[PDB]
């Protein structure tokens, strides 16, 4: 009977930045899907794997509810075969991805005047993310063939950007805040389920 | 020292009856007319009759159709009656004494009409139901603080507001009601104190909304 | 209208003020007993003199010698003379008799005493308590006071943006001092609230303007 803690997802006042992303365990309750496309406070609600008409019927073994802050033109990125800083380098999804991804214009709540760069992302990487892979480390990025050795230099980079978001940018360059639901249904009984399901 | 003190306010239906009284008491040297006066928004006065200590009575010809005095020298007091009554008569009334002065073989003079007002009592006429308020504490946040409490949607006019039961009074602000376009009114009232008051001090703001019959306390704490 | 004074009237300190109240044509002053109230705000009207004539007149006890009553047949009216006007005086002034069985009153002249000095307003600004948000509401006040002249313009901001929605603002009224004192409300859903950094309340007031902030 209990019902999923989605607004403390959805209703979180912190966001983390996007290459330090945030997920949560979501198990053992009633997911009642319909709350969140019934409200038209998302700029993007797109469901991968499963049609969003009849969500609330299904069952999964368990949900991840990754979140954090990205600008409004990398919104895109946040889907299965992307390409992009984002995808790339901060957060990959899985090319046969299920779940859903809901995103929505945070510029009143992120931005600030002059500027909030507490909301950083990862610019560089020797290699791609793997699904679902997150990379925290703030180790010095070698570009050129010099190893520089943590000292900030010709082709040797700081590898985390501040956005600089601030309330003027524009809609493009403005925060977003997006939390990407994942359907994890594995070979074992299904701990969340909707409203309308047998 | 004479002081007129009048009933409560309220509320009366489009055609109901609104009914006063007036109470006295202090000095009364000499002899007197006694009168209910009532004020609109607009701050008009219109005088609507007065009544002896016999019981006879004089009303305003545009109100007499419809206006009773009458008077109760046993308990000092006299009373308004005024039917079929609508929107016109929302209005602060005031009771109020007028000395009688020179006296000539064949009439009675007022020269000084009005010697003594009470506070004024305002009736709503409205079709509209009584609401009593939803009272909200407004946390506190030099060395002064503000606090105060928010007294929300309620209907009609007038709530009165005290803090610690009228213990505190330096500092009471008390500020007028804004009007909602719900028809609802809302105001607010806030104490000034030292912070040093805040961990010791309990500051509770009683509201008052007689035309609800509503008292409610609330603490308001840091 | 049995009796017409004018809605307003402004005099200087220590200058003297000739408030008139008119009678309607098919009526003659010059056999009218005039009664004259002073009420302040809050207050019930404070009777201050009868004139008819010279030598028929009354003057309320505790009621100072500077009001005096005089009529002027030609313009067909009761004039109530203040000399020495002070700042005390402030106040709504009435006319009133007995006519046609009943005593009717003039409108009010409200009088204004020139030369008060300005004074700065002071804002404090609240947030929705936790209990209204808990009850689905949101509501900031915005108070202001203990400001002169009482011309003020309130501003609302979401984050740093205008803000006209769901905004109630009271008309400044003197409170006890002659000083003036506003209200302003806010009305928000807890979403709009939660969503923002800051609302902010800007109170100009000559040629300064006092901004306070509150945020979640
Ligand atoms: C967040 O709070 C709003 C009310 O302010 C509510 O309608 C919404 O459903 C909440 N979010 C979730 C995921 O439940
Ligand atoms: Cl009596």
């Known amino acids: 009977t209990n019902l999923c803690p989605f607004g403390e997802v959805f209703n979180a006042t912190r966001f983390a930045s996007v290459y330090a992303w945030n997920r949560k365990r979501i198990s053992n309750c009633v997911a009642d899907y319909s709350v969140l496309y019934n409200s038209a406070s998302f700029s993007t609600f797109k469901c991968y794997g499963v049609s969003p008409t009849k969500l609330n019927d299904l069952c999964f073994t368990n949900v991840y509810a990754d979140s954090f802050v990205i600008r409004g033109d990398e919104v895109r990125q946040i889907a299965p075969g992307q390409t992009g800083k984002i995808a790339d380098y901060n957060y990959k999804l899985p090319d046969d991805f299920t779940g859903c991804v809901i995103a929505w214009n945070s510029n009143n709540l992120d931005s600030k005047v002059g500027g909030n760069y507490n909301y950083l992302y990862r610019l560089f990487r020797k290699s791609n993310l793997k699904p679902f892979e997150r990379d925290i480390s703030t180790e010095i990025y070698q570009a050129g063939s010099t190893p520089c050795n943590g000292v900030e230099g010709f082709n040797c980079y700081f590898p985390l950007q501040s956005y600089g978001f601030q309330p003027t940018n524009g809609v493009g360059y403005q925060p977003y805040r997006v939390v990407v639901l994942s359907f994890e249904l594995l070979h074992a009984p299904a701990t969340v389920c909707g409203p309308g399901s047998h | 020292q004479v002081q007129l003190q009048e009933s409560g306010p309220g509320l009366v239906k489009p055609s109901e009856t609104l009914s006063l009284t007036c109470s006295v008491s202090?000095?009364?040297?000499?002899?007197?007319?006694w009168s209910w006066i009532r004020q609109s928004p607009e701050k008009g006065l219109e005088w609507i009759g007065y009544?002896?200590?016999?019981?006879?009575?004089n009303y305003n010809p545009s109100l007499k159709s419809r206006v009773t005095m009458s008077v109760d020298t046993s308990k000092n007091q006299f009373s308004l009656k005024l039917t079929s009554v609508t929107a016109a008569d929302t209005a602060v009334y005031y009771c109020?004494?007028?000395?009688?002065?020179?006296?000539?073989?064949?009439?009675?003079?007022?020269?000084?009409?009005?010697?003594?007002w009470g506070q004024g009592t305002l009736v709503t006429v409205s079709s509209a139901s009584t609401k009593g308020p939803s009272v909200f504490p407004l946390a506190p946040s030099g060395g002064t603080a503000a606090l105060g409490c928010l007294v929300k949607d309620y209907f009609p006019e007038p709530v009165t507001v005290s803090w610690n039961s009228g213990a505190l009074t330096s500092g009471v602000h008390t500020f007028p009601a804004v009007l909602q376009s719900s028809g609802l009114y809302s105001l607010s009232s806030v104490v000034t104190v030292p912070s040093s008051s805040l961990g010791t001090q309990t500051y509770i703001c009683n509201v008052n909304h007689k035309p609800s019959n509503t008292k409610v306390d609330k603490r308001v704490a840091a | 209208a049995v009796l017409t004074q004018p809605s307003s009237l402004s005099a200087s300190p220590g200058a003297s003020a000739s408030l008139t109240c008119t009678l309607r044509?098919?009526?003659?002053?010059?056999?009218?007993?005039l009664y004259w109230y002073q009420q302040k705000p809050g207050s019930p009207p404070r009777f201050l003199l009868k004139?008819?004539?010279?030598?028929?007149?009354?003057?309320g006890s505790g009621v100072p010698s500077r009001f005096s009553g005089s009529k002027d047949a030609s313009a067909n009216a009761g004039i109530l003379l203040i000399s020495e006007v002070q700042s005390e005086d402030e106040a709504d002034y009435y006319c009133?008799?007995?006519?046609?069985?009943?005593?009717?009153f003039g409108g009010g002249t409200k009088l204004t005493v020139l030369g008060q000095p300005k004074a700065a307003p002071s804002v404090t600004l609240f947030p929705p308590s936790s209990e209204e948000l808990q009850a689905n509401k949101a509501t900031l006040v915005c108070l202001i006071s203990d400001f002169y002249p009482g011309a003020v313009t309130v501003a609302w901001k979401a984050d740093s943006s205008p803000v006209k929605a769901g905004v109630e603002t009271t008309t400044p009224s003197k409170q006890s001092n002659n000083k003036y004192a506003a209200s302003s409300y806010l009305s928000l859903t807890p979403e709009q609230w939660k969503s923002h950094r800051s609302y902010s309340c800007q109170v100009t007031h000559e040629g300064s303007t006092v901004e306070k902030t509150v945020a979640p």
């Open positions: 109020a004494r007028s000395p009688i002065g020179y006296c000539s073989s064949t009439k009675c003079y007022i020269d000084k009409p009005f010697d003594s």
């Open positions: 202090g000095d009364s040297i000499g002899t007197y007319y």
């Open positions: 009544i002896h200590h016999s019981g006879k009575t």
């Open positions: 044509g098919g009526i003659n002053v010059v056999n009218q007993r």
């Open positions: 004139y008819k004539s010279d030598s028929d007149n009354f003057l």
């Open positions: 009133m008799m007995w006519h046609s069985s009943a005593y009717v």
